[PDB]
Amino acid sequence: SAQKAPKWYPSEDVAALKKTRKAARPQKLRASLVPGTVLILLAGRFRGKRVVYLKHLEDNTLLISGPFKVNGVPLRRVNARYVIATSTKVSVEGVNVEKFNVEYFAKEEIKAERVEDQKVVDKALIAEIKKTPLLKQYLSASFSLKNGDKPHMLKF
Amino acid sequence: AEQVAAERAARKAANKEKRAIILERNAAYQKEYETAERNIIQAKRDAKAAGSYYVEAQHKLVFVVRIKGINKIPPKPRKVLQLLRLTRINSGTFVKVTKATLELLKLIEPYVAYGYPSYSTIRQLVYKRGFGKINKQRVPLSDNAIIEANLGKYGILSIDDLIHEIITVGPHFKQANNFLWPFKLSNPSGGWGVPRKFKHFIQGGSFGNREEFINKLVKSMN
Amino acid sequence: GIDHTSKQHKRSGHRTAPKSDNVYLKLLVKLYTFLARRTDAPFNKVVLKALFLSKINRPPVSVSRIARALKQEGAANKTVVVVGTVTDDARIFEFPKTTVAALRFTAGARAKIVKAGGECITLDQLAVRAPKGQNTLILRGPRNSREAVRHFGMGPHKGKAPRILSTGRKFERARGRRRSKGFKV
Amino acid sequence: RVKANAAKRAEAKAQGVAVQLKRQPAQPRESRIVSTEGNVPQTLAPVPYETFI
Amino acid sequence: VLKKNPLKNKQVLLRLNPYAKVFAAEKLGSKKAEKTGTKPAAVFTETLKHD
Amino acid sequence: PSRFTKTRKHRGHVSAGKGRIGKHRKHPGGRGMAGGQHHHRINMDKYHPGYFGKVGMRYFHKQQAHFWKPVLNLDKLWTLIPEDKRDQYLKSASKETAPVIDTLAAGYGKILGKGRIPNVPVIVKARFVSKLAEEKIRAAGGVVELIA
RNA sequence: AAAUAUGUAAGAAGUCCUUGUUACUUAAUUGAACGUGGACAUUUGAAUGAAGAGCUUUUAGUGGGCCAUUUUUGGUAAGC
């Protein structure tokens, strides 16, 4: 031989895992995140876009809407840590939302159902936005840090 | 073949018996400590009332932390640091105060800080960095059965028993206190409060008896 | 750093195995370490360690020294154990019965023992008859009889035998050895 | 001290033990109350420097 | 295999020392003391404020 | 074999285990047994008291042989009888038929008396005896017969 | 006449009772030395510590030293 055989080999038997104790418990959101609250998206495709928050989804994400007809953002998932919660606020009591969950956004262009859903949720919101002057205009402009803005000082 | 639970019976039950004894025992100490504290408070007040002066008993127990490294140390203080079990910087141990140990403390003032520990800091020393010596082998406390297996002989069958033995400097302070490994502390988190450690506490330095100010140090180091 | 107070990394200083390379010896050791771990019998711990011993620390026990021991009060029926070799001794004329267990019996020792209707036994036959070493009498031979130790501790007034090759008058017996030749030792 | 020990050993024992006859070091002081009666505290200060010579 | 600080880890807090449960339960860490009012002798005061 | 030898282990270190200061030089002590009475005296006295000077008488042309005279103690003595033959004599401690032992034939010169023979007659032929050996021999009912 | 240094002691190899041995020793069965028999146990005789203690053999290198605080000699002094 070129090399002597080893005298002992490892077993090829793979152990099982120890019985880990790590309960998945529900994520409670920072108190600033109540539905109706306008969010500033900090990252991603719609970064800088100001948007309305609708529902906390079962995968911890946030359901938001532009409204699409205001600024072009659809019903969409958004990650709660990439969001600045502002202090301005629309009532969201005429918006259904029961429908929407994780599977609704399963990967599986745009299905008519989605397009229709957007109209049903947005006409409700739009009704509400119009109640406070300039809110719609506010909702169309992107957020942007200006020279000498200090996020650790600014109130949102 | 029973045993399955049929000797888990005896065991589970008997363990419950023991926590019971520990509960009644810990509730006892709590009373003991409160009325001790209050009596001296009312001692001091009664005396003022009477136009007099209540001088507390002298402290029976100190806690010593080595503050100096391992180099350039003269032989007499050196042997004493060893006998007190302080062979590395920031380690610490308890010392019951008598003339025959007082003079040891005297001989090592340049290299240690010490003072009179309160219940809170003895409690938190043991809860967090308290290890027994067991066939040597420095073993973490973490469960009461460890204590009772090794000190049960002297009464003392829980962690808070251990503490009660230390703080009252009970009849078995030698065995109890030797049982604890030297506490291994970190550097103070606040810092030392002084520009230079190696002067006495009294001269704006760090060593010597600093009496009750030992607790702030130790906590910042624990 | 640590103000150490004893050498670090210090070996205990006791053999742990024998230094011998002998299968059978190593097997007897397999036997007795098992016996030592799984019985609380002190006998087995002692025997374990003796097997580790080197030749010096295993002087031979003689059959006459064996006989002497059996003369102990309440001891004639004890089975004697020698962890080493057992030599013969024409100097005794009447040797008793008993059972000796040892590592080695010389031709003549075995004879003497067996001719008195005794029994020579190996340490493992010993193990099966007496797992807690019940009823046993462990004998060791004389260690400090060895020719070597005649010269340990050589020095003035110690009285202890020169390392010398030829001997006689005229070999290290003058100046320093007698009052009239400088001095004495 | 040996003779003494033997005494209070037998001496006690006969009563019904409870001895303690190892020597013990100077203990620290226990509490105590000091009165002021006939003994109000005298106040001293440090004193100025001076020569006398 | 991993030392857990009773001081933070209620679980092992309560494993060692079962009194902890009631200590907390009864607050005890904030015991109100009996409000008595003894007053110090003028002697005590006089000499506190002396020179 | 060189294989196991410390000089294999010293390759690569400068001084070969012999020191940077003290070095390995040719003959610092001097050669051989030099210095005996001078710089090597502490080791000679101690370890070798007796070395220098003389004692007793010179003997020119001493023929070792003249003094050939091995000792055998009663200690043994019975060993000079072959064991099969031996057991037979022990049993029948007896005049009229006691064993003859030619110790000279066995190659001994003197019989000495180390310790206790059985209480059995022996006839012991030897060149010399210690007073004691003869005594013990006789107390077993035996005799020494002086040969040459 | 200090301070710092330094000898010994803090028991089971201990203490107490009874009374054997000798050629030593006493006026003396007096002593002295060594003992037999009996009585008392881990608060059995201060503290602190002890990753144990004791012991034996054999052999290397070394046998230019230098420095700091304090004590300190010579020297005016010196990185003497």
Next chain:
RNA sequence: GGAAUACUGCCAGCUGGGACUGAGGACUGCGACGUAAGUCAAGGAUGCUGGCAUAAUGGUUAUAUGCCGCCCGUCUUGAAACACGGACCAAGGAGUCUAACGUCUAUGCGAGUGUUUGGGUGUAAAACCCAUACGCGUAAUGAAAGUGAACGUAGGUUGGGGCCUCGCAAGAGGUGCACAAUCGACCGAUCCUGAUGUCUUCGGAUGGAUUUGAGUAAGAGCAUAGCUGUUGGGACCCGAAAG
């Protein structure tokens, strides 16, 4: 008069932001929460989602940039030294063998041990076999002539592992090898004593002594081999002026 606050201390009061780590691999423990079923943050990380599946991450390498980095070897108290060797590279280049030894260890056999000068024999410098001696050991001590190791269970005392007996156990007693300490006895030397006796000067019993020995006191050796150490040898390698 009646409060508040500061300061110091305590809580097994609650709670937010941030960093590093996730060792282990069925179960087994100590617990906690529940009326319970069951649950858990209780003897070491899992759940959910995405992107890439390639030089992307990672290795190697050159370069650049931050900070760091004096020439090795040597003797020396102290070397980067304004101390010495060394321009460069290959190849060679220094504790060996032998006689005789000390300690230790392994192995054979053991009061013995050592076949190898020789002989026998052979598949021929091998392997196998062997008689007589000899060497070391089993006796010491004296300059020598010489003498030559049991009062005694081969002794007493103290400690001793182990074993034995009692006890559920803790303990108590019995025996006690090795080893250690101590007091004795035995052999030789030296000194004293000097019985029974005698080719009247030989003989030297017996009992002793702050003397003395590398001794006895139920043997431990002999041989082969190894590391280390010792002496003689060119003697770790290289070097005189000389004779």
Next chain:
RNA sequence: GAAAUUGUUGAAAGGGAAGGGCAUUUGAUCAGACA
């Protein structure tokens, strides 16, 4: 048919030496593992 040392070719750096350490950028190069 090694090395010292040399010619050419290719690539790179170079404000009074060069070489080295920890680290990363950049360039060049390459292993593995995936299904």
